[PDB]
Structure 1
């Protein structure tokens, strides 16, 4: 009677096209609770190794025992919040009001932007404060960029720019907090926002695979048995019924696979350090040597080595934070062999 079966692949990650920005763009931010603070950070993917950990989970029978855990090493050097953008609430949603920029700029920010030579920070700031008095001030975010020059393994010097929201106590307090950070030079680090043991949402543009067929792209079956020898091997049965007399976009077809933005939820931050403790012998294949600010993310992270990945405090965590996990061993064994 033709057994039931779930359709091939999800319809919630489409259209399956090439991403517009290689730099991910979070479409959601954490809720305003504690003290004011930047709600995200970024780094460059290096590779993977494993670490032996002491079971942190209070509800696990293995609590306190040795445990092997996969880890993706991400170089997370300091970034720079170069501006404070203000949004205003309008009948058509949120719109950017103005921006407060600085003077101290990284030597190579001009590889991407037309750096400001003349700007009035106070006028912009005033406009924002007047907006707040009127009660039309929407959320507050910081224009941020990375320093690829600090990461030898990454060929680029051209910084990656992204906007990150600032959540916190009162709007007045977080406004001040924002301005303070910016005015200095915007220099901030992974430490300032995240603590080892917390859950973060990592966003990233997946590894590109160019054009692929329905079998790989959607998970459809290959032709089976005798059918597989007739002239059709990796093509679906049909593009649809007689009626409707058209091909529905829901049928699994060939196309661009990979190089899409994804936001992987609840990634546990195993450790945030600095140096070469996580580097592998011979070097991370197709990457290089890590010797500086890094972050060890539990499991996998979307994207290839060298790609920019974004961090954000988990917006929907399942478990309570279990801070600073005891790392008994980090493998440095060659990834070649």
Structure 2
């Protein structure tokens, strides 16, 4: 009677098209719980190695024992919150009100922007506070950019600009917290936002693969047995029934596969350090040598080596934070062999 079977692939990550921005954009943010702070950071994927860890889980029978864990190494140097954007609550949703900038700009920010020559910070600040007084102040986020120049393995110098939100105690306090960060020079580090052991949400634009067939793109079957030898091997049975007389968008077809934005949830931050403790012998294949500020993320992260990846405090973690895990060993063995 033809056995049932779930459809091939998910309909939740579509359309399966090329991403608009190589730099990921979070469409959600963590809640305003603790003290005022920036709700995200970024870095550049380098590669993978394994780490030996002590079982941190109190509910595990193996608690306290050695444990080998896969880790993706990401070079996460300091970023710079160059401006403070305030949104106002309008009858059509949130809308950008104004921005408060600075004067101290990184030598190569103009490779992307039309850096401000004449700006009035105070006025914008005033407008933001007046709106706040009126009770129309939506949320507050900081314009941020990376320093690719700080990462040798990454060829680009043109900084990746992205807006990150600030979640704080009160609106009045996080506003101040924001303004302060910016005034200095907006310089901040992964330490400032995260701590080893916390779970982060890593967003990134996956490894591109160009056009691919249904079999790879949607996980449909290959023609089987005799059917496989008739002239059809990797094409689905049919595009749909006689009626409705049209091909439904839900049928697995050929197209752009890869180079899409993805936001992987609950990624444990095994360790945030600095130096060359993680670099592989002979260099990370197709990347290079890591000798600077870095983050060790448990498991896989979307994207190819050199790609920009964004961090965010897990918006829906399942486990309780188990701070600063014990790292008894980090493999430095060559990734060639």
Q: TM-score, normalised by structure 1?
A: 1.00
Structure 1, unpaired ranges of 5+ = none
Aligned partners of 1:203, 1:256: CA distance in 2, in Å? 19
Deviation of the 1:111 alpha carbon: 0.1
Deviation of the 1:236 alpha carbon: 0.1
Aligned partners of 1:202, 1:24: CA distance in 2, in Å? 10
Deviation of the 1:68 alpha carbon: 0.1
Q: Secondary structure at the match of 1:111?
A: coil
What are the Cα deviations for residues 52-92 of structure 1, in whole angstroms up to 9, with x where unaligned? 00000000000000000000000000000000000000000
Aligned partners of 1:170, 1:206: CA distance in 2, in Å? 37
Aligned partners of 1:313, 1:168: CA distance in 2, in Å? 13
Structure 2, unpaired ranges of 5+ = none
Q: Secondary structure at the match of 1:179?
A: helix
Deviation of the 1:115 alpha carbon: 0.1
Deviation of the 1:267 alpha carbon: 0.1
Aligned partners of 1:139, 1:317: CA distance in 2, in Å? 23
Matches within 5 A, 1:101-140: 101-140=101-140
Deviation of the 1:299 alpha carbon: 0.1
What are the Cα deviations for residues 33-60 of structure 1, in whole angstroms up to 9, with x where unaligned? 0000000000000000000000000000
Deviation of the 1:216 alpha carbon: 0.1
Aligned partners of 2:219, 2:253: CA distance in 1, in Å? 11
Deviation of the 1:130 alpha carbon: 0.1
Aligned partners of 1:130, 1:192: CA distance in 2, in Å? 30
Instruction: Tell me the equivalent position of 1:184.
Output: 184
Aligned partners of 2:111, 2:213: CA distance in 1, in Å? 38
Aligned partners of 1:139, 1:31: CA distance in 2, in Å? 12
The Cα RMSD (Å) is 0.2
The total of aligned residue pairs comes to: 337
Deviation of the 1:168 alpha carbon: 0.8
Aligned partners of 1:103, 1:8: CA distance in 2, in Å? 53
Deviation of the 1:132 alpha carbon: 0.2
Deviation of the 1:191 alpha carbon: 0.1
Aligned partners of 1:161, 1:168: CA distance in 2, in Å? 22
Q: TM-score, normalised by structure 2?
A: 1.00
Instruction: Tell me the equivalent position of 1:212.
Output: 212
**Runs of 4+, deviation exceeding 6 Å:** none
Deviation of the 1:7 alpha carbon: 0.1
Q: Secondary structure at the match of 1:141?
A: strand
